[PDB]
Design a protein around this ligand. Structure first.
Ligand SMILES: Cn1ncc2c(NCCCS(C)(=O)=O)nc(-c3cccc4n[nH]cc34)nc21
Length: 822
């Protein structure tokens, strides 16, 4: 019992609670997930699961090959005080290196292991070292005891009666009228729509009206939603017309509704938990011709957001067997399906049974993701997408985990192939499981629309993750809860007075002494194990949301460097938006990796842990672009061109390193101009832009520009100065920048459909305010869909020149708005 209690505290929600249900789908899902859990648990290798080797099967990039002398790679092994280097070949296994040198090779300071039958080059930690030009240091010790991971042992027209609506208290807006709109939805595609006669808007409105729809009962598709909405659009709520047992929903229902276009929340089957304040509604249920081929291929070629006309759909359907031969035609083909007709759906299933071309096609994530969005409610359609995902290596799963977790919001039922898939992969791998936990917990904490479903999924995971991880989560959760309290208490108290800096270090003193865990895993970096705080370095930050600047020691003695673990705790913004933006950045990098391109992005760790509150990784040796200018000229926005180049020469001791910084800067600057333009978040105040002492540029605080959402992006003259240019001039570096940009840009366009679906999904599940048809179709233009590589190339170069023609104009403007208040 104290176990289900522990689960509830780790989850942040009671999954056994049944106060907010009108059926047993949630409980049914708890039971159904048991099998999938035990199946994955009872078939994972204890040793490999305990050490969770982080590896990849992708080729080693060109830019990481040129980092290797010979077929040689050095690795420093450590034991007690002894310590020796070793010459290794990129292609030999960890076992080989051992005999070349029962113990195992663990990385210093990290809970990371170099184990398994894979080349030494196919490890992420090794590749990380090479990229950063770091040296691989491992300590030789015994493998973690796999025991520590032990797990606790019929032809009628459909009709619905609208009894009426009840609300305890209605807005002070006298006086208006209300009618109820009942839609039978599927995908976001409304099959049939009926309304009630308007009625005076009182706290109780009774119609007692039968709304007879055009669609026969037998023609109702599994997963179809009875969407009930109130107009003056004030309220909405949904009811699956066909339940989780293939039964036709029947009987009396009193649904509490959500108060207020492409938002995923509008899809939920969850009813509003707040029964005392929410609006309530009461209902009662009782050889193809040459030309046509071209036309079809042109249709199949268009982007995911390109709308299908009636003719387009009729064509796709009539030639469905020809369309079936094109995996890329699936999303559009299944959109051309009349789900409101049982005969058609039946034929669609007959079609799916002929999945030779699909089953054999190479995995296209962008394509797979499309079948998992709000446009598809059929579980058989969505199942083939999940099928293709099964072939993903744990490496790629981590890449798309966040948005796969978000895609669960588009599932009609709590129990889905997507859910079970995430459950399985999370249980198969500790790293995946770790992030799955936080991603789900993130949603469960600030999403009433989906907390129930995600809570049931999280519970299933926790019951199979193992004793060891359950303990880590417990420590991580405890720490986060304590620090959040401090961040809130501190926020309640401009300049960070002594009275507050004293209070902070004071509060931290109270916690550290006999309260906070002696050690905990860094949520955004599972390998790292944080120890005791360094109160001296801790401070409240000069931010309008008074974020905590915290620094910990590494609990790992074998750790090499003495550098502390820096974490920023912050309340005020929804960090989920930041997560999605940062995750996309990693996706853009992996993409660029396939092309062997390396823009030096810094997708720092960021984890949403609660309501408008989460933690951020502190990148070391970095400062604001604005701060580097506030030094030269403070109160006035008198930005000077050369200051940035000065700051670098200053921080780089050997002038050589300086040239390396100016290079790192040109790479990092191009990557952020391209990546930021595609995402339409490139117009930022230089306060939201930082640079490393090594010249690595990177944006920050993405939740800020998305919470209040004119130059294409930020290529200010001070950046240009570092590139050796001013005004009507060029360079050997600027040409380089313009060179890398067009490269980086053109490369992204080779994955247009992937970016589009991710961007679209990001907006619907993460940016509730940015959910219009126009908001989404921005990335189409940004990626200049359907354009020659030449045209596109020019398009971006125009964008660059527009930043030139602007100089400090917008920056200064930002200075007027943010800095002061104009
Ligand atoms: C990721 N990272 N690394 C350093 C750093 C930082 N450094 C603070 C020092 C800046 S200074 C003192 O040089 O002006 N501030 C922030 C940051 C602050 C506020 C909101 C944010 N959202 N996302 C990141 C945010 N992120 C940072």
């Amino acid at each position: 019992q104290a176990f289900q209690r522990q689960l509830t505290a780790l989850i942040g929600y009671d999954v056994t609670d049944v106060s907010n249900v009108h059926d047993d789908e949630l409980e049914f899902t708890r039971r159904g997930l048991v099998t999938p859990r035990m199946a994955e648990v009872a078939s994972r290798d204890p040793k490999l699961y305990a050490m969770h080797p982080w590896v990849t099967s992708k080729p080693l990039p060109e830019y990481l090959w040129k980092k290797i002398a010979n077929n040689c790679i050095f690795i420093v092994i450590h034991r007690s005080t002894t310590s020796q280097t070793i010459k290794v070949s990129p292609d030999d296994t960890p076992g080989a290196i051992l005999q070349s040198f029962d113990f195992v090779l663990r990385v210093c300071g990290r809970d990371e292991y170099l184990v398994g039958e894979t080349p030494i080059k196919n490890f992420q930690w090794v590749r990380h070292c090479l990229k950063n030009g770091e040296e691989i240091h491992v300590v030789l010790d015994t493998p973690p005891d796999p025991a520590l991971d032990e797990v606790r042992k019929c032809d009628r027209k459909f009709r619905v009666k609208i009894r009426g609506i009840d609300i305890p208290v209605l807005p002070r807006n006298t006086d208006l009228t209300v009618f109820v709109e009942a839609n039978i939805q599927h995908g976001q595609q409304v099959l049939c729509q009926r309304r009630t006669s308007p009625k005076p808007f009182t706290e109780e409105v009774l119609w007692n009206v039968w709304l007879e729809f055009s669609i026969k009962i037998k023609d109702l598709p599994k997963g179809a939603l009875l969407n009930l909405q109130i107009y003056c659009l004030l309220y909405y709520v949904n009811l699956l017309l066909i339940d989780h047992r293939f039964l036709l929903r029947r009987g009396e229902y009193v649904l509490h509704m959500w108060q207020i276009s492409f938002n995923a929340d509008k899809l939920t089957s969850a009813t509003n938990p707040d029964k005392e304040n929410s609006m309530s509604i009461s209902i009662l249920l009782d050889e193809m011709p040459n030309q046509l081929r071209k036309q079809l291929e042109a249709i199949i070629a268009t982007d995911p957001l390109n709308p299908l006309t009636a003719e387009d759909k009729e064509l796709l359907w009539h030639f469905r067997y020809e369309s079936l031969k094109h995996p890329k035609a699936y999303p559009k083909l299944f959109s051309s399906v009349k789900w409101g007709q049982q005969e058609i759906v039946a034929k669609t299933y007959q079609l799916l049974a002929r999945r030779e071309v699909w089953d054999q096609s190479a995995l296209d994530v962008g394509l797979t993701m499309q079948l998992l969005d709000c446009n598809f409610s059929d579980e058989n359609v969505r199942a083939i997408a999940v099928q293709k995902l099964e072939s993903l290596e744990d490496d790629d799963v981590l890449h798309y985990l966040l948005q796969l977790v978000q895609a669960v919001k588009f599932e009609p039922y709590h129990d889905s192939a997507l859910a079970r898939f995430l459950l399985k992969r999370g249980l198969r791998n500790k790293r995946i499981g770790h992030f799955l936990f936080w991603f789900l917990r993130s949603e469960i904490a600030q999403s009433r629309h989906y907390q129930q479903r995600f809570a049931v999924i999280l519970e299933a995971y926790l019951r199979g993750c193992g004793t060891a991880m359950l303990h880590d989560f417990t420590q991580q959760v405890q720490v986060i809860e304590m620090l959040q309290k401090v961040t809130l208490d501190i926020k309640s108290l401009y300049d960070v007075s002594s009275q507050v800096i004293s209070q902070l270090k004071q509060k931290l003193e109270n916690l550290q002494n006999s309260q906070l865990p002696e050690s905990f895993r860094v949520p955004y970096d599972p390998g790292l194990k944080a120890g005791a705080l360094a109160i001296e370095k801790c401070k409240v930050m000069a931010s309008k949301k008074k974020p905590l600047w915290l620094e910990f020691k590494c609990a790992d003695p074998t750790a090499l460097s003495n550098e502390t673990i820096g974490i920023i705790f912050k309340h005020g913004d929804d960090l989920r938006q930041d997560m999605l933006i940062l995750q996309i950045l990693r996706i853009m990098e992996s993409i660029w990796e396939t092309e062997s391109l390396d823009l030096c992005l810094l997708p720092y760790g960021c984890i949403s842990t609660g309501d408008k509150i989460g933690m951020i990784e502190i990148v070391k040796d970095a400062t604001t672009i604005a701060k580097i200018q506030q030094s030269t000229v403070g109160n006035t926005g008198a930005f000077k061109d050369e200051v940035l180049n000065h700051w670098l020469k200053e921080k780089s001791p050997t002038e050589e390193k300086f040239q390396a910084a100016v290079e790192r800067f040109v790479y990092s600057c191009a990557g952020y101009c391209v990546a930021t333009f595609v995402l339409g978040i490139g117009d930022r105040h230089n306060d939201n832009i930082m640079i490393t002492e090594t010249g690595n540029l990177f944006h920050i605080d993405f939740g800020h520009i998305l919470g209040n959402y004119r130059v294409p992006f930020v290529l200010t003259p001070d950046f240009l100065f570092v590139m050796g240019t001013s005004g009507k001039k060029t360079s050997p570096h600027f040409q380089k920048f313009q060179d890398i940009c067009v490269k980086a840009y053109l490369a992204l366009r080779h994955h247009t459909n992937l970016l589009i679906i991710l961007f679209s999904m990001m907006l619907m599940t993460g940016m509730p305010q940015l959910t219009s048809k126009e908001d989404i179709e921005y990335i189409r233009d940004a990626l200049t869909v359907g354009k020659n590589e030449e045209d596109a190339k020019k398009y971006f170069l125009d964008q660059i020149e527009v930043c030139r023609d602007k100089g400090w104009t917008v920056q200064f403007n930002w200075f007027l708005h943010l800095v002061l208040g104009i």
